[PDB]
Amino acid sequence: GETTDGVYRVMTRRLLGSTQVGVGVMQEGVFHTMWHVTKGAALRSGEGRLDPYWGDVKQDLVSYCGPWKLDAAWDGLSEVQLLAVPPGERAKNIQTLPGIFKTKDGDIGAVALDYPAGTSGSPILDKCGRVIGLYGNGVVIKNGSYVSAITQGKRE
Amino acid sequence: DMYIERAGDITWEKDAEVTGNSPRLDVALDESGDFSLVE
Ligand SMILES: Cc1cc(-c2ccccc2C(=O)Nc2cnn(C)c2)cnc1F
């Protein structure tokens, strides 16, 4: 299968036509996405198979072919870019200053950008182009819009 | 049966659409990985 670093769409044919269920990151030969996109199922890349390696429903993250590789963190200060890959539309950078999710276990960066659910797993970047987490796990607010955590895993 | 398709390089892009606000929200995370608003 294709193993070049970059951003990828996650597709299915189990519905009408070809439907985009979400997005992920290929880095150092490991595929990174959100748990709710694949539910831990195997993936095809051309005639190649990608098997799940690590996952956690609570973090809503999963890695394929290896351990989680992405370890960069939001600085807490600077704007970031969502590399949005929406269904049927070209990859597009959107630059934004994250807000904060305040939880009993700590503060997390959050991005207030509204995209279809099939955009889940798009990477959030810092100014050096490092993936600081994935978009698509968050909350619907007073206004009716979606606010996503910046969800990052840990690298062992 | 799910398959992947490359969509781009991961690159910062100088002068991209700048949008979105920066809300501070009290949230809870449940064992199913669902965030919810505390109030
Ligand atoms: C109509 C609609 C869209 C979304 C949504 C919007 C942007 C990114 C991701 C999601 C999303 O679906 N997240 C998500 C987490 N866990 N599960 C199972 C699903 C959220 N709620 C909705 F009603």
Through-space distance between the first and last CA atoms of chain A, rounded to whole angstroms: 25
The pair of structure tokens assigned to A117 is 């659910």
**Is A92 found in the same domain as A59?**
no
Q: Which residues 104-123 of A are in CB contact (within 8 Å) with B?
A: 104-105, 110-113, 123
Q: Measure in Å the smallest separation between the Cα of A155 and chain B Cα atoms.
A: 19
Q: Are residues A49 and A110 in the same domain?
A: no
Query: Which residues, 6+ apart, have CB-to-CB distance to A69 below 8 Å?
Result: A27, A28, A30, A32, A63, A155
A55 and A13 co-located in one domain? yes
Q: Are residues A96 and A59 in the same domain?
A: no
How many alpha carbons lie under 13 Å from residue A82 in its C-beta half-sphere?
31
State whether A84 and A59 are in the same domain: no
Task: Please indicate, yes or no, whether residues A101 and A142 belong to a single structural domain of this protein.
Answer: yes
Contact between chains at B21 and A99 (C-beta distance less than 8 A): yes
Please judge whether B7 and A85 are an interchain contact, meaning their C-beta atoms are less than 8 angstroms apart.
Answer: yes
Q: In this structure, what token pair is assigned to residue B22? A: 């920066």
Give the structural domain span for A42.
Answer: 6-64
List the structure tokens of A69.
Answer: 């590789």
Residue from A3, A61, A93 whose CB has the most chain B CBs within 10 Å, to mutate: A93
Here the CATH number for the domain that contains residue A118 is 2.40.10.10
Number of domains into which chain A is organized: 2
Nearest Cα residue to atom 5 of ligand 1: A117
Distance between CA atoms of residues B20 and A146, nearest Å: 11
Alpha-carbon gap, residue A74 to A135, rounded angstroms: 13
Q: A107 to chain B nearest CA, in Å?
A: 9
Q: In chain A, which ranges are E strands?
A: 6-12, 19-27, 30-33, 43-45, 48-50, 52-56, 61-64, 80-84, 92-96, 99-103, 106-111, 123-125, 131-134, 138-140, 146-149
- Look at strands B24-29 and A48-50 and give their pairing: unpaired
Cα gap A87→A1, rounded to integer Å: 22
Residue A138 lies in a domain: yes
Chain B CB contacts of A9 under 8 Å are 4-5, 7
Q: Give the CATH number, domain containing residue A30.
A: 2.40.10.120
